[PDB]
Amino acid sequence: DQVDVKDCANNEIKKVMVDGCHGSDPCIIHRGKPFTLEALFDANQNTKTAKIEIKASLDGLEIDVPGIDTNACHFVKCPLVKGQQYDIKYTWNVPKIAPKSENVVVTVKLIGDNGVLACAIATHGKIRD
């Protein structure tokens, strides 16, 4: 089902869903497991390379989540031309370092060559082991 998130870009993402959480409900990310999220977004600019960015917050300590795809053109058809929409199905390998944080916030961000192609911010979130 789709999850609850607010595109921090500019209405770019048309809707981001994950195969596990329900959205409004809380999400339990088990560090070490692959969390997949598909985000549709209308390329806000023409670029030959795009990158996805997922950052998880620890209700206090903000961290960055590596082990991801630093080039979403592998799932989307790059160059993403401004005015077309793309659907990226990416497997976000959760880091085994993620500490059981009572509340976590994941940020999905796409970046082409002119700025951030899109963006997403999840609220209700929780990490477990």
Swiss-Prot record:
Superkingdom of this protein's organism: Eukaryota
Keyword list, A-Z: Allergen, Disulfide bond, Secreted, Signal
Biological-process GO terms, alphabetical: sterol transport
Single GO molecular function: sterol binding
Species assigned in the record: Dermatophagoides farinae (American house dust mite)
CDD domains: Der-p2_like
Subcellular localization: Secreted
Gene3D superfamilies linked: 2.60.40.770
Disulfide bonds listed in the record: C8-C119, C21-C27, C73-C78
Keyword Secreted: yes
Full protein name: Mite group 2 allergen Der f 2
Entry-linked SMART domains: ML
Pfam families recorded: E1_DerP2_DerF2
Further details from the record: The sequence shown here is from clone 2. The N-terminal sequence (AA 1-8) from clone 1 and 11 are not yet known.
InterPro entries, per database record: Ig_E-set (IPR014756), ML_dom (IPR003172), NPC2-like (IPR039670)
Family: Belongs to the NPC2 family.
